[PDB]
Amino acid sequence: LNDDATFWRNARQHLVRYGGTFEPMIIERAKGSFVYDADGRAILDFTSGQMSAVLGHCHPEIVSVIGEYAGKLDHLFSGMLSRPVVDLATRLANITPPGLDRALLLSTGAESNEAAIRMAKLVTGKYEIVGFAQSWHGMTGAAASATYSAGRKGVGPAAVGSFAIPAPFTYRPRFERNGAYDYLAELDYAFDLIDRQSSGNLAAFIAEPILSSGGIIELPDGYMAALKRKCEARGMLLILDEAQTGVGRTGTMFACQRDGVTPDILTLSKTLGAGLPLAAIVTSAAIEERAHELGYLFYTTHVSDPLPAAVGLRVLDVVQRDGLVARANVMGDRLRRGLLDLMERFDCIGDVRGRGLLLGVEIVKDRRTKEPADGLGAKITRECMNLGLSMNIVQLPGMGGVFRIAPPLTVSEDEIDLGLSLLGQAIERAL
Amino acid sequence: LNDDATFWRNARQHLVRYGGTFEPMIIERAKGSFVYDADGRAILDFTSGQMSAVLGHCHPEIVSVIGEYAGKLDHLFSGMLSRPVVDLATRLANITPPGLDRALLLSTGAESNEAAIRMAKLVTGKYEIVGFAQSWHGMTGAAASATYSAGRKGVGPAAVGSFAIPAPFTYRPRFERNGAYDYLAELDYAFDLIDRQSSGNLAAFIAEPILSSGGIIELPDGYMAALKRKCEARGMLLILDEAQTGVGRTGTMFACQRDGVTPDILTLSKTLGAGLPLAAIVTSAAIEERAHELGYLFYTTHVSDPLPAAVGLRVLDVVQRDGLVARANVMGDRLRRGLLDLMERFDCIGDVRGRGLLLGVEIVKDRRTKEPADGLGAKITRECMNLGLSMNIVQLPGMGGVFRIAPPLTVSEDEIDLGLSLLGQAIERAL
Amino acid sequence: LNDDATFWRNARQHLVRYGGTFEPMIIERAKGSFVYDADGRAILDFTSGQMSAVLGHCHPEIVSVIGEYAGKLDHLFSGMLSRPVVDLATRLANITPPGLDRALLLSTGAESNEAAIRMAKLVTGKYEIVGFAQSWHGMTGAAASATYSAGRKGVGPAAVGSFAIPAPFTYRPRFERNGAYDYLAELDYAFDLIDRQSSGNLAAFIAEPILSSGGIIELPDGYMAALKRKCEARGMLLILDEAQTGVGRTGTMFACQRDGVTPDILTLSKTLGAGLPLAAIVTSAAIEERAHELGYLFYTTHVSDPLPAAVGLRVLDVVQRDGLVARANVMGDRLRRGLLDLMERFDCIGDVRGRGLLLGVEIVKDRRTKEPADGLGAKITRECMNLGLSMNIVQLPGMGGVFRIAPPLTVSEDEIDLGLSLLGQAIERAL
Amino acid sequence: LNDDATFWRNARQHLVRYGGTFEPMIIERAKGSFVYDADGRAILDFTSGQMSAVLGHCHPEIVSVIGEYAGKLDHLFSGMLSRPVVDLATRLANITPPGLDRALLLSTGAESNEAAIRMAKLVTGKYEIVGFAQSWHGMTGAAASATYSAGRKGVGPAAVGSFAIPAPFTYRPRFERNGAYDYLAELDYAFDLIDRQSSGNLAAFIAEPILSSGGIIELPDGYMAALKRKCEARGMLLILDEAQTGVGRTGTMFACQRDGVTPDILTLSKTLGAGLPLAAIVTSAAIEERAHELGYLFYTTHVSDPLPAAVGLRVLDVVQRDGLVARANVMGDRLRRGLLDLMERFDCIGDVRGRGLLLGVEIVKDRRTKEPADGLGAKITRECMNLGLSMNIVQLPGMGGVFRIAPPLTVSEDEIDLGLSLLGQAIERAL
Numbered sequence A, B, C, D: 001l002n003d004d005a006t007f008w009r010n011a012r013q014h015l016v017r018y019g020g021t022f023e024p025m026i027i028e029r030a031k032g033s034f035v036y037d038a039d040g041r042a043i044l045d046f047t048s049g050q051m052s053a054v055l056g057h058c059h060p061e062i063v064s065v066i067g068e069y070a071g072k073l074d075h076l077f078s079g080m081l082s083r084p085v086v087d088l089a090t091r092l093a094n095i096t097p098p099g100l101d102r103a104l105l106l107s108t109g110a111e112s113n114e115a116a117i118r119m120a121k122l123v124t125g126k127y128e129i130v131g132f133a134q135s136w137h138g139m140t141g142a143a144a145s146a147t148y149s150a151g152r153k154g155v156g157p158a159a160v161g162s163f164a165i166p167a168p169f170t171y172r173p174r175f176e177r178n179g180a181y182d183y184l185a186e187l188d189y190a191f192d193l194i195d196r197q198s199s200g201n202l203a204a205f206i207a208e209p210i211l212s213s214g215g216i217i218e219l220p221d222g223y224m225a226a227l228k229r230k231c232e233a234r235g236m237l238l239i240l241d242e243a244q245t246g247v248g249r250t251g252t253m254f255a256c257q258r259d260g261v262t263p264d265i266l267t268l269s270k271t272l273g274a275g276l277p278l279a280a281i282v283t284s285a286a287i288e289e290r291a292h293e294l295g296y297l298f299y300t301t302h303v304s305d306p307l308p309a310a311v312g313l314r315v316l317d318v319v320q321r322d323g324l325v326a327r328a329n330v331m332g333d334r335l336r337r338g339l340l341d342l343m344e345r346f347d348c349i350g351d352v353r354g355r356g357l358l359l360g361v362e363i364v365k366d367r368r369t370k371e372p373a374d375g376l377g378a379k380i381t382r383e384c385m386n387l388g389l390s391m392n393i394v395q396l397p398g399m400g401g402v403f404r405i406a407p408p409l410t411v412s413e414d415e416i417d418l419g420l421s422l423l424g425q426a427i428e429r430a431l
Ligand SMILES: Cc1ncc(COP(=O)(O)O)c(C/N=C2\CONC2=O)c1O
Pocket: A299, A300, A301, A302, B050, B108, B109, B110, B111, B113, B136, B137, B138, B139, B208, B212, B213, B241, B242, B243, B244, B269
């Protein structure tokens, strides 16, 4: 049992608490779309862990490559190259759109965003960074400074030159023009104010294609194209953080492929390492060349380490060969329709949004007031778990609590149905 | 051969350059204290890669544990605990000095420093951070803001409230009192100026016990105790970054054990993961408790992931069982004496310093002017490599180029001698 | 003649240029509503100089008091009090609304805003300052940081924690709700974004009742009350800068009297000194008391100097006795109707706004496109001058050039008519 | 009597407290080197008020010019020139050293420093400002950011890029080289640390030739020349604030004339206006030209107002004609010798320093420990006043309380002797 009192005593005495609460169970093993507790109870992992287990837990091919390299090529001095690094950088150039040529292989999501923000700053000679008011880019300095969905209070000033604009949120619109939510006029209005505040040092805009932590908010039609133009007109780079959207989760290899808008710098992480710490930035030859001339520096302990790179290479291979990107659309369709049926059944489901296998379900009191259903969100989450379904709700100011659903791309038809099943029971048991 | 033209073509076309130059060889395998090129030539790794391969490359026990977990427990949702995390946190509490009780398990060195700086800020309600003018804490925001040995230009303002004081450097003293280098009076003088500048928001002092990037500068007798008092008197936390000194490299488990001065927050990384991305902060129960009450947040993708934690646990086990800490003293003694013999032989060796298996050799023109030997440092480094010896020189303003020597704790008597041998030839071939 | 070549040679060789251009004439004397050139030509001063000559130039009573004190009590050590200082502070308490009790007597407008911003910061323990995107508070540090109508580029970062929100501008509305310009919803939307960006250190909102430099933009009905509530709800002080609106110009002693909303800190300057350097902040007994306990400091060379204070006292006396505040309404009405007749005559006049003797006339191409009439504004200004009428146009981004009309409160019916006359000719001569 | 209870009641109810305490007397008139209370008691003004009454109080010629202009030319629109402005700018060019050509005429000391700091920033494209740790430049934003003798706590962060270095203080030396206070090596050491911290944006160094608020600390022989070289080598402008030293007080017209080191920008204020609010910056034609091309802006209400300018012109005339600069040396010599005799008499006088009529007397417990004489300083100041002598002591961290003596340049032999007399009695009455 999950109750090993020595265990919980040690957890309590020697762990730093870092946000949230610890689930009251001890996870002993993981395989495919499931995690197992100390009792042996299978818990269906509908979040792919911290949204990273793209191939589910302990994928045989992943296990193999890790082994293969653990005992062959592990970690190196950062000036030394090896085959997996060059292979992975080459693959990344080949599968991203034209205009993205060169890669930097790192360890975490925040790290990737920091390296990108640092390069933008260097290359432009400027320093002001603009993000969305509901963003999530990481916990480290610059990454945190561009993060507005949370973490801004009680920890000192933010980086000098930080600005946010409101993200286009079709569910709860707030900017109108002629009895219509004009998200493009909102965007124009947002930039006007930025322009007035700027000290004349706008360097970059950083954005997630779909704001995950912010509540599964998809940038609507024409937006990204509009945003890139605002940047271009101002001499700003556009940095696209696809930590959650990259590597096939939304139905395209990269979310940016859907709009056909290619960013100046693309950052990847979570999905790319398949549970392991691996991340990257991909930029154009022109930008890298200039950064170089200018003395760009981002030298860390694990930059270009062979083991993680070799894992990333295998992840890409499997995704391509097994057509997991298409799979994402087919399974997402099945999952989405299921959620729509629940929404038919239950009045507390106010919205079902997202794309491919990055879906959001917003819980509400009144499907008309769209009044946030406080409390409800958490009982649901609670019953889900009892029922054997791991869910994650995010609760932000002014909107209803949002369930972030993101199962492995290797998820089965059956697992999807099990999830829908459990979720339905959790809801009815909760009201 | 190392000349695979497809290889180098791809490196050139698809890699972002991040500082330094790429060594012109392709590393194919690694084992023990050696790395092997495409020709099969063994290169003796006197830097333990990027100073992380504590047990050398591809250590059998490391290989085993990694396997064991790759296929059993890999990556999890950050609210879920598992045995390796609790075991590792518990072990860390047990081997660090009294006053360090609770741990946070992360991925990189900069990340660990960021989490520590963020906690200090939260817990004090303040935000000014003081570091050494020759420090190296990482490339991310806060960590970079506290980094003065390099990286400060062309990338925008630093974090608000950043200050540096000079580090005590006995080789090139600059503060006297009665014809004597009084490093404690220097420290007093340094703080006086800080006091005058501060806005009244001093939160923490961050320091490396031995400044590695800064040139293997060991804080001298009584200093740390003196520094901790300056902090205490000001309501500041002392954060000790043992990324390079921790886990037995200096001859004690933690460098802080040598002085008997225990920091408020201790950060670890490099050595702890043995090539893999794992890092941590260890703080006192009191500080963690307050951070908690205050809402401390540092939630990342891989915080508390089982695989890396399980690796860290094994590293600690092996180090303890095989008495690698003592080994560090015995091998360091042998290595140090060798360097002193070279210094007898060659006039260009101006100083041999450091502790245990973290040694520095400062190259000079004139052992009296102590004039930096420019050029010389790099030919040497160059001949070393030809000779089959991987070395790392750091070149900072006002001092002679420094070789940073830090072989695996598993290094053999023979490997040490080989290194001394090659280094002697490299020198004579270089002048 | 205005052509003294020695004069212009010296101007050119020894004057620092500080914005704008120097009018090509030499002003020799000034009296009442007129300035006279070297030829003796009278120029009607429709801006009261730099909007400060409330009683016109060289008012006999002003001349008398200045004399009276020049030779009696001039300048003192800042710890020494005198009668004019106490009298003036007492008068200010008596004529401002209830809740404003204590005064600080300074020298310039920016200085007054700095002293107020510094007190807000002290008293709240916070530091973020919010202003309007079209504001003008001064050229010095904090005052400039809160200034968005201009001056923000090429001079380094602004003060940490500076934010702006859009000012409610009824002429060119940009925020709608149900086919209506909802300036209160705009205000709500503005604050929401602020809230998301703030580091949790909001100290004050600083505002002009009528944005003068920004284009004579009057805060519309209910706005100020709404703004004060936003502040209150956030623990922020409201600082009202009446440099241009105070001391009867708008038809009330203080513009804030019109809305019946009393600020936490009121700042005055321009009008108060009647050409001379005198300014002030007025705050509540509670706020002063706390600032005091906290060690508030704003010690300058001329704080509490008797001469300027004695001038300020006389200005208040004359304004009260001669009923210049009412006069402002009667003359403003006459002036306003005149401008409306011109607007009937000329299509280029798009708007006539403002209050009392602080009026604005916005020049446009098309009274429907409301397209800014570039060029036109400046010819007009140019012909005015030839014609003997001193005008001031302000040209800001996205709106038509604005003439800022603000004659002395002592202006005569005849002078008003002369002004209207000349202005009409200037216009027809200009198109 | 000074006891008018209505008076003190109003002071208490309606004055904002701004530092220090109000002297318990009501000053009714002032003339020459004296101020008179409500009882008619003459108080000898040994500080020239707030160190501004260069010609003493209510100087007949000053009274005349003020009158002359009050009723002739008072205040103007800032784009309009007049004779006094051009005359004063021309005179300033003529009496300052070669290399200072163009002037900007403002209102206060802080304002002048702000305009200078803003121009340096513009012209260099940079923003970091370096000052002395014991400086005093004013209460407004930038000026306050460069002020380290006080005011830095409880009011939020300082301007981004603020640094201080220690000022050379021969009385209490703290940097040695070979048993000698090497203030030049101290300077070298100071800059080294700056260099390491800078983000590569050093714009200017701002300094007082003699730190007045800091304790009458005269920059010693060769220092300024050394400082200017440090600046030059770094592409930094040197701004010299002669608010207290300018216009003959030290025995030369400008203190900078003594060392023969001409600054890039010179700022003046206090003395220049002779009690009235007038200040200025003087820079080179080259710097003004560039600032101009770059769009320099510093447009205020009273910039270039004729009245104050006309006063400044007269002050310069009188100083020149009556040879007040030489007078400063002769009277300063007499005053200095007197203080040295007191120091012979009393053990509590530890040092007598300064130059011309800007003298400092440091009070100590032990003329050997040089232990600050707390309490003593204030009784003395207290008895002085009873005795009829207005003195000002400044008390800073680590040094003994300092009396700042600075009588009018028009002071008589007799007044000097009276002062010495009273001061001697005050001392003996105090111990
Ligand atoms: C003392 C110290 N702290 C923190 C770090 C940052 O660790 P990272 O996040 O890069 O993994 C480094 C890295 N030391 C490096 C990094 O590159 N070269 C060095 O000598 C370090 O030496």
